[PDB]
mmCIF file of C-alpha atoms in Angstrom:
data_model
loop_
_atom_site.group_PDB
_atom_site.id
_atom_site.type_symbol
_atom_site.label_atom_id
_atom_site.label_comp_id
_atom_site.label_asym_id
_atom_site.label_seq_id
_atom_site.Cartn_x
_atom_site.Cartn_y
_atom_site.Cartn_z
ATOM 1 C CA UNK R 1 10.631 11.982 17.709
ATOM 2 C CA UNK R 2 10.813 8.224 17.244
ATOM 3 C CA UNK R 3 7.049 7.567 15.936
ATOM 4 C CA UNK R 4 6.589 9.890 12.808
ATOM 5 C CA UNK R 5 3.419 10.641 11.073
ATOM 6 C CA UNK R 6 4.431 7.696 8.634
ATOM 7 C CA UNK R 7 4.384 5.307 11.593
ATOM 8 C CA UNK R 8 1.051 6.735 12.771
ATOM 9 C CA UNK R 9 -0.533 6.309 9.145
ATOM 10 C CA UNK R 10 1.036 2.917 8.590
ATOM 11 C CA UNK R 11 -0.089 0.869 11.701
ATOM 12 C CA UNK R 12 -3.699 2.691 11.135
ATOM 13 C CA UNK R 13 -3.464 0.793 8.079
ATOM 14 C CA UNK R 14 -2.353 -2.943 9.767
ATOM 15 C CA UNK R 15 -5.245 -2.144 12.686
ATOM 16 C CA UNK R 16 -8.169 -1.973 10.000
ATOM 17 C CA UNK R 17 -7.109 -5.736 8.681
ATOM 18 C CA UNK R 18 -7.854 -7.093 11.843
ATOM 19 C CA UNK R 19 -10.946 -9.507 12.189
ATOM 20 C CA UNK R 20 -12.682 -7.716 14.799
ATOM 21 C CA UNK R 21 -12.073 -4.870 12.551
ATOM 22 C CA UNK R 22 -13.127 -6.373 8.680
ATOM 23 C CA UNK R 23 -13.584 -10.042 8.008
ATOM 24 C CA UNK R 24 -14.645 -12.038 5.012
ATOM 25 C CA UNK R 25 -13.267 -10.533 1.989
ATOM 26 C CA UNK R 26 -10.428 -9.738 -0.216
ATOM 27 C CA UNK R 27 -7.379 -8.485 1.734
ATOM 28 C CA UNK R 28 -4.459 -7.102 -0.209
ATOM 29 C CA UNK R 29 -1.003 -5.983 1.027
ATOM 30 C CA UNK R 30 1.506 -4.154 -1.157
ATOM 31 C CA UNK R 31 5.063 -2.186 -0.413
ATOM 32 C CA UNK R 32 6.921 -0.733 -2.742
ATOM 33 C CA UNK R 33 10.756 1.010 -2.127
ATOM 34 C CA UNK R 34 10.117 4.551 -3.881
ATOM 35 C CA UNK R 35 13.730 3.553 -5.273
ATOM 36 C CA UNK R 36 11.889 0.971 -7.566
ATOM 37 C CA UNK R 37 10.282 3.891 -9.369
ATOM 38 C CA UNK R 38 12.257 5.792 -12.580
ATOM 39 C CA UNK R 39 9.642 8.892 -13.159
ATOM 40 C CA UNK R 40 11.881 9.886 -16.101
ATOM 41 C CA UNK R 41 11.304 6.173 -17.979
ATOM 42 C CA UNK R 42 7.746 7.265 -19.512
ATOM 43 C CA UNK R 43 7.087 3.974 -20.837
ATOM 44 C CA UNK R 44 6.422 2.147 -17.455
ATOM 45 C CA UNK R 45 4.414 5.494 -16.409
ATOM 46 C CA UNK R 46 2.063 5.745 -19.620
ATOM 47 C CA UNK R 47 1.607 2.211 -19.514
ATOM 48 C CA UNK R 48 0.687 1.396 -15.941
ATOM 49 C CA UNK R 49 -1.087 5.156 -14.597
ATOM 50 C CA UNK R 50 -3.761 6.647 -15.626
ATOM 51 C CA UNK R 51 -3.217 10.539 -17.143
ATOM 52 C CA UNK R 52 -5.842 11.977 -14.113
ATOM 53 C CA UNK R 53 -3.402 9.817 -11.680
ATOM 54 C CA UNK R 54 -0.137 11.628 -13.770
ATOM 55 C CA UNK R 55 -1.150 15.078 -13.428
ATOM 56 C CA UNK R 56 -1.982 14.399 -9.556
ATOM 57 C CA UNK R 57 1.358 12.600 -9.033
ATOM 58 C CA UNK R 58 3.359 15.327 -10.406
ATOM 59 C CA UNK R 59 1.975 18.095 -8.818
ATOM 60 C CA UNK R 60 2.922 16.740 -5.264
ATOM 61 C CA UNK R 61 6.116 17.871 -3.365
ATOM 62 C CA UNK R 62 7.847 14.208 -3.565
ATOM 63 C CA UNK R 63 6.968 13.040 -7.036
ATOM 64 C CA UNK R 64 8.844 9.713 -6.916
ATOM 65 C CA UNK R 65 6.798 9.075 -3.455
ATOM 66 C CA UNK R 66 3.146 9.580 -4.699
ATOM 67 C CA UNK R 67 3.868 7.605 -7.735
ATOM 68 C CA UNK R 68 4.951 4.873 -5.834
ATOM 69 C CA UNK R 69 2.057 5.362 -3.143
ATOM 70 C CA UNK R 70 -0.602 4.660 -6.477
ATOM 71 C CA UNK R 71 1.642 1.715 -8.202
ATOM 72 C CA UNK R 72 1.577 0.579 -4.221
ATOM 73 C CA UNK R 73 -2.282 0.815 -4.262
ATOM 74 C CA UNK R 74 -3.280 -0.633 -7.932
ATOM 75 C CA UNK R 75 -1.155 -3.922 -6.745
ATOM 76 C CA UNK R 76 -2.625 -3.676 -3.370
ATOM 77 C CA UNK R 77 -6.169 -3.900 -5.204
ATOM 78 C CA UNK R 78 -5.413 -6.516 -7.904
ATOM 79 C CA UNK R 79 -3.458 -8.553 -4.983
ATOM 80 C CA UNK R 80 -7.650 -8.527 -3.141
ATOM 81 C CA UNK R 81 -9.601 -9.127 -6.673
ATOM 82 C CA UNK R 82 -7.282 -12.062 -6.339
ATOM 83 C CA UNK R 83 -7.428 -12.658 -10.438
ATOM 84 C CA UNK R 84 -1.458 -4.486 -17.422
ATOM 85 C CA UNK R 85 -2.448 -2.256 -14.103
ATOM 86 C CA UNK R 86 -3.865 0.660 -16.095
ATOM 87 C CA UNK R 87 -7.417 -0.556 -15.332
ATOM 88 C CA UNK R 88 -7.544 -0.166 -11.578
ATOM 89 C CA UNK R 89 -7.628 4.091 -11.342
ATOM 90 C CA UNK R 90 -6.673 5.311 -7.882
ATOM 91 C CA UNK R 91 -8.468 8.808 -7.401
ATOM 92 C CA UNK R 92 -6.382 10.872 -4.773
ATOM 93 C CA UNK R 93 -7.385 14.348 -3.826
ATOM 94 C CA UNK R 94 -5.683 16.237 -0.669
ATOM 95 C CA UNK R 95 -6.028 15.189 3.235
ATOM 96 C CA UNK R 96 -8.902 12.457 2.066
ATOM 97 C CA UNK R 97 -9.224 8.381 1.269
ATOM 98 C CA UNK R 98 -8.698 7.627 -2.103
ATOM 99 C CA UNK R 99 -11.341 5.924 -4.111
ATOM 100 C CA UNK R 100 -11.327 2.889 -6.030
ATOM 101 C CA UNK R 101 -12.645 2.816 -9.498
ATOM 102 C CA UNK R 102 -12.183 -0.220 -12.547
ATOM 103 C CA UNK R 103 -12.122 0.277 -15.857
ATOM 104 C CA UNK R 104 -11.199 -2.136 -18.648
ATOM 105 C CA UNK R 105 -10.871 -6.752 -17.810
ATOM 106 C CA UNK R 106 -10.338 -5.741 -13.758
ATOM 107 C CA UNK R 107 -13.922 -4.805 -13.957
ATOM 108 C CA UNK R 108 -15.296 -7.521 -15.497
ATOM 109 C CA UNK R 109 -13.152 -9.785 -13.167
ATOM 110 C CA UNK R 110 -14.639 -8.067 -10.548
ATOM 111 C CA UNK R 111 -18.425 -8.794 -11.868
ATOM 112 C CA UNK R 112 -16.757 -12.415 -11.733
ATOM 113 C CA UNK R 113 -16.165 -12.771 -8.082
ATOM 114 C CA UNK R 114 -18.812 -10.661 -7.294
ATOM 115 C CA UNK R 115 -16.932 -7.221 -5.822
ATOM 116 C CA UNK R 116 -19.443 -4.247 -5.177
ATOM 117 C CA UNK R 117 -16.833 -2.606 -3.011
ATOM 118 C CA UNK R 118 -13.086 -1.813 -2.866
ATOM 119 C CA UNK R 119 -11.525 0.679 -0.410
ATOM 120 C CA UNK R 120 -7.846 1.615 -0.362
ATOM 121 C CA UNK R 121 -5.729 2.878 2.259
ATOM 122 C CA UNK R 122 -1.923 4.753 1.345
ATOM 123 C CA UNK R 123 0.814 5.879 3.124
ATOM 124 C CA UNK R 124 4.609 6.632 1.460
ATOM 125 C CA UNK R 125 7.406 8.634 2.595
ATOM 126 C CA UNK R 126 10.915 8.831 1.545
ATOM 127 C CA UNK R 127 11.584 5.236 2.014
ATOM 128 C CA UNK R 128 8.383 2.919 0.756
ATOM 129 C CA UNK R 129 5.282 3.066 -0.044
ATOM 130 C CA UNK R 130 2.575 0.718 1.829
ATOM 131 C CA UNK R 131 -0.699 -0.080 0.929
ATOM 132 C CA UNK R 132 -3.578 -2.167 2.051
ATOM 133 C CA UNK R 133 -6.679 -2.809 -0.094
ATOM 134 C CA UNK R 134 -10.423 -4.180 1.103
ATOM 135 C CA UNK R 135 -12.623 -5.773 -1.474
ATOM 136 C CA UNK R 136 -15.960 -6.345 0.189
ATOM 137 C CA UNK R 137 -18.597 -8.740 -1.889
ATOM 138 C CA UNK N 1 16.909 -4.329 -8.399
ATOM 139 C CA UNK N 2 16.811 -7.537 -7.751
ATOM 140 C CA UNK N 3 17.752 -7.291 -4.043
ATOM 141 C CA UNK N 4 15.137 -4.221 -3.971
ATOM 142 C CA UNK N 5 12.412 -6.694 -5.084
ATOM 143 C CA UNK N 6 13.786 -9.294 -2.282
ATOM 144 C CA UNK N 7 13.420 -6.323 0.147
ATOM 145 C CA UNK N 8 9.867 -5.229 -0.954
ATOM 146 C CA UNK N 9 9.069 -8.894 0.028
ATOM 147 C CA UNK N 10 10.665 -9.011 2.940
ATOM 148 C CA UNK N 11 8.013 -6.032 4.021
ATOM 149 C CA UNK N 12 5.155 -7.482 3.052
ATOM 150 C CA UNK N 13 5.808 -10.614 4.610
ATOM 151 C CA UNK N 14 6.858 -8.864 8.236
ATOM 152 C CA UNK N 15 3.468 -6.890 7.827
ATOM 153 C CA UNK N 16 1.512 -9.974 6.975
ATOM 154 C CA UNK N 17 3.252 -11.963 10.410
ATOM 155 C CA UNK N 18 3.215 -8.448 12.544
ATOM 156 C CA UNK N 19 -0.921 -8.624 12.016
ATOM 157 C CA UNK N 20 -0.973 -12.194 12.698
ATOM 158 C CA UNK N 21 1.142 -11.440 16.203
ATOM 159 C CA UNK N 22 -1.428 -8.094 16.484
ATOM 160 C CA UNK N 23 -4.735 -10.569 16.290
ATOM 161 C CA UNK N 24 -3.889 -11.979 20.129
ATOM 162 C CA UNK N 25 -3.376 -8.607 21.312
ATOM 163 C CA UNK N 26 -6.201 -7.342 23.316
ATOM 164 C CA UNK N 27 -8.090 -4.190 21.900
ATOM 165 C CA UNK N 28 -6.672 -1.625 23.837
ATOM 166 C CA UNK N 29 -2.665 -2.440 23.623
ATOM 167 C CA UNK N 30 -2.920 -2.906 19.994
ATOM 168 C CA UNK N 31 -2.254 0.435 18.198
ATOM 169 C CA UNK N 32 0.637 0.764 20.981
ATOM 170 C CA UNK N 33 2.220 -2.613 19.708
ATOM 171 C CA UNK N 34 1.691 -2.028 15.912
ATOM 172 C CA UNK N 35 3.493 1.869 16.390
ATOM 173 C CA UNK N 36 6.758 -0.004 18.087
ATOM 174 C CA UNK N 37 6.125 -2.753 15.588
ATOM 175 C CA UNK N 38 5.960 -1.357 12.545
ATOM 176 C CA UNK N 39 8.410 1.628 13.286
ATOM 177 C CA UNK N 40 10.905 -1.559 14.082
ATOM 178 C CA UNK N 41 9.924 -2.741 10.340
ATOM 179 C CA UNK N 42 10.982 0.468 8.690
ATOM 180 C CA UNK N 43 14.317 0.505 10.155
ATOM 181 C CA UNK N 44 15.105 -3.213 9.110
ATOM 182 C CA UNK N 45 13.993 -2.388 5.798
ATOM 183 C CA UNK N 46 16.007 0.935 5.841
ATOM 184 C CA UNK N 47 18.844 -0.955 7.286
ATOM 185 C CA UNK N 48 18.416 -3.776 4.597
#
């Protein structure tokens, strides 16, 4: 009753940044309030998400949630590259991780510092959106 | 909006310090403590 599946997902999330957990490497923390995000202003949308992470977004049950859950995600992962968002591409697909994937300068930034790997972990629900990304060297 | 980007601070920097409280935990309490912990969060951001 008191600890929803939000509160199971989220402290998941806070465990795996422990340093008996992972240790030496880029740790990024972002929230967003799912207020913050206007789906109907298309200008922020087109400019800052992918059209792969669009048609995803929009087919979910809480729109305004799962955008928020990426935008939470592509600041997560720029916060642990520690250097526009449309170049980090968040790849969601049903009751799995998402995957990390760069595109335009994050790439090359991340040939800079040296990043082979970056994981992402999400949760959102009708509040915020929290999410914590790992960029391993 | 500009409160709302106070408040989206606010969360990230009571995640950031509930970790750092969650390091000293021993291994076994610690998903116990971060469920309370971070449940506590959502209401003071609710709340807020």
């Amino acid at each position: 009753s008191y600890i929803n599946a939000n509160t199971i997902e989220t402290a998941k999330m806070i465990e795996n940044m422990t340093k008996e957990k992972v240790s030496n490497g880029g740790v990024g923390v972002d929230v967003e309030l799912i207020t913050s995000i206007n789906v109907e202003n298309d200008t922020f949308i087109e400019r800052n998400f992918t059209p792969q992470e669009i048609e995803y977004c929009s087919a979910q049950p809480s729109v305004q949630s799962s955008f928020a859950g990426t935008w939470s995600a592509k600041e997560a992962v720029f916060k642990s590259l520690g250097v526009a968002l449309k170049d980090i591409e968040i790849v969601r697909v049903n009751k799995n991780a998402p995957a990390v994937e760069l595109h335009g300068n994050a790439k090359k930034a991340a040939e800079e510092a040296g990043v082979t790997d970056v994981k992402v972990s999400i949760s959102h629900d009708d509040l915020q959106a929290v999410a914590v990304a790992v960029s391993t060297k | 909006v500009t409160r709302e980007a106070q408040i989206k601070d606010w969360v990230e920097n009571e995640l950031e310090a509930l970790k750092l409280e969650a390091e000293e935990i021993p291994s076994e309490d610690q998903n116990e403590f971060l469920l309370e912990r971070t449940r506590e969060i959502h209401n003071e951001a609710e709340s807020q």
